[PDB]
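WARN  no MSA supplied for this record, continuing single-sequence
INFO  ligand: D-ribose
INFO  echoing inputs
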Amino acid sequence: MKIGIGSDHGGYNLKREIADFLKKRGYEVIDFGTHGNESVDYPDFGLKVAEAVKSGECDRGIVICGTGLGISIAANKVPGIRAAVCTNSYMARMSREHNDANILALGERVVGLDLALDIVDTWLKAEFQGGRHATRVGKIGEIEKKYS
Amino acid sequence: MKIGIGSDHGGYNLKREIADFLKKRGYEVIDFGTHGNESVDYPDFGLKVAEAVKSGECDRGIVICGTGLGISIAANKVPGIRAAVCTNSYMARMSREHNDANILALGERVVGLDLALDIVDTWLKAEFQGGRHATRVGKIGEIEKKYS
Ligand SMILES: O=C[C@H](O)[C@H](O)[C@H](O)CO
Ligand SMILES: O=C[C@H](O)[C@H](O)[C@H](O)CO
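INFO  complex generated
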């Protein structure tokens, strides 16, 4: 499965580390930048990732900034995107099992590298559980439809 | 200022504790439910708080579920809303300083009571820094306008 990855300059080093981790594990990775330490705007990169997931060019995405917060708020503006800011593996698992998140958000300034790899590992392996969780995900879809 | 709060059954007990904390400090609190431990759907209560913040009936909102994830994703579907899921005081502070978050999201199954009160304290007292952070909040606005 193809993973889209993106960051601002606040998530760029952790992005390089996760790109490396993902390839070693045999995922195909599309990197939407940013491509250096220059100051950039997290919404641009959140959008590239979220649009790639929306359009099926990626199956899922990972977005990284200092805290994860800005880039995932932005990613969540896109209809059909469910971006989950996770700071431990329990949140990562539930974001798959309950919320069927198709974007994982991370904060390079909040979680250390090995904690972030545990989180990414957990999230890639967890599976949506349907049932009442599909019903609730539909109700997120109803919000999107209301403001569309 | 007036604070809207809401939860699903997974966030109901933390909600009661936070309401009590906020009153004690002299905030006006509008509780949007849920009002018991019955199984409910986090988007309904996310929407209620998010629409109250948007309509200016509350100044800011606090939304609570098991992880904070579902309710914050749903709250983020409403234009003009910026819901931040925080698991520590640092994230809470940055979410105000950088992202100008007007909803705090919490997970009752992730953060213990006194940590959650530390996060709420930090979040209520932090202030938006403007500047380049305003520019980036406008680019979040551009995404909402694109899918509007
Ligand atoms: O929420 C966005 C991120 O924290 C950004 O990396 C910081 O603003 C870096 O200045
Ligand atoms: O993201 C929403 C929360 O995890 C909910 O409280 C749980 O699904 C409770 O079943």
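Residues 1-148 of chain B form a domain with the Ribose 5-phosphate Isomerase B; Chain: A, fold (CATH 3.40.1400.10).
INFO  checksum written, moving to next record
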